[PDB]
Structure formats: structure tokens, C-alpha cells
Amino acid sequence: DNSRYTHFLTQHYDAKPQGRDDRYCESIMRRRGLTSPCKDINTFIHGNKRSIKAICENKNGNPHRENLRISKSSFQVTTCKLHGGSPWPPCQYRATAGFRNVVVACENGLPVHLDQSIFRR
């Protein structure tokens, strides 16, 4: 059952996004099913998917805290933060682009969870 990996990608992976502005966030959050209810904060990782999967190996990862893994490489990311307000659509978002390593949990060699705490900022 690779469903949690596929769900991780749905919630947290967008390969080649273009503009990573507020309108990007508002559109991707709708497209990926994160607006009913409005998710408060959600980060998308960009770039090549193999680099994300590799976090689960020694190839691109270190143990982190209790049961997480932190990547050795840095990734382009976009954090979408809800502006206001209501927990139901329409959901307004503010985008913050970044470039840093990421914290995941792995299961069966695949990333199945993103730790959002490092993107609360």
C-alpha cells in the first residue's frame, strides 16, 4: 500500500510550479484538495522527485528528532499560509518561497509525511 506516499506527493510535491506567488498558492491548494476545510499552512517541495525519495536512504538523509528524517540536500519549497480567517472556501493564501532542507517521515522507503513545523516561521 503506497497510498500514503501518493498522498504525500499530492499534498507536498509540485515539480515545476512557475510563479510561486500568492495566486499560485490559492490555485494549488484548491487543485490538491486542501481547501475543504482550508488548511492553515502547507508546504510544497519542488524539483526532481527522486531527490525527495532519497531522503529515506543514507543517500540524502539523517535521523531527526524521535522518528523523522532530515534531508542532506536543500530543496526549493513554497509555503502557503492561510490569510485570516475562515476555515471554508474561498481560502486566501500568502506564499513564501524558500530553499532549504526538509524534514519527512519515511515508511517502506518512501516519504509519507512532511513536518510543517520548520515552515511555520
From Swiss-Prot:
Motif interval(s): Nucleolar localization signal: 30-34
Q: What is the effect of changing residue 65 to A?
A: Abolished binding to PLXNB2 receptor
EC number(s) given by UniProt: 3.1.27.-
Q: In which tissues is it expressed?
A: Expressed predominantly in the liver. Also detected in endothelial cells and spinal cord neurons.
Q: What is the effect of changing residue 7 to A?
A: Significantly decreases binding affinity for RNH1
Q: What is the effect of changing residue 38 to W?
A: In ALS9; reduced ribonucleolytic activity; low angiogenic activity; reduced mitogenic activity; reduced thermal stability
The record lists the effect of residue 111 to L as: In ALS9; loss of angiogenic activity; reduced tRNA ribonucleolytic activity; unable to translocate to the nucleus
An example of a GO molecular function for this protein is: copper ion binding
Q: Does the keyword Hydrolase apply?
A: yes
Task: Tell me what effect the entry lists for residue 34 to P.
Answer: Homodimerization is similar to wild-type; causes mislocalization in the cytoplasm; strongly reduces ribonucleolytic activity
Q: Name one GO cellular component term.
A: chromosome
How the protein is affected by changing residue 11 to A? Slightly decreases binding affinity for RNH1
Cite the effect that the entry attributes to residue 21 to G. Answer: In ALS9; homodimerization is similar to wild-type; localization in the nucleus is similar to the wild-type; strongly reduces ribonucleolytic activity
Protein name (Swiss-Prot/TrEMBL) = Angiogenin
The species this protein belongs to is: Homo sapiens
Question: The organism's lineage?
Answer: Eukaryota, Metazoa, Chordata, Craniata, Vertebrata
First-to-last residue of the parent protein present: 26 to 146 of 147
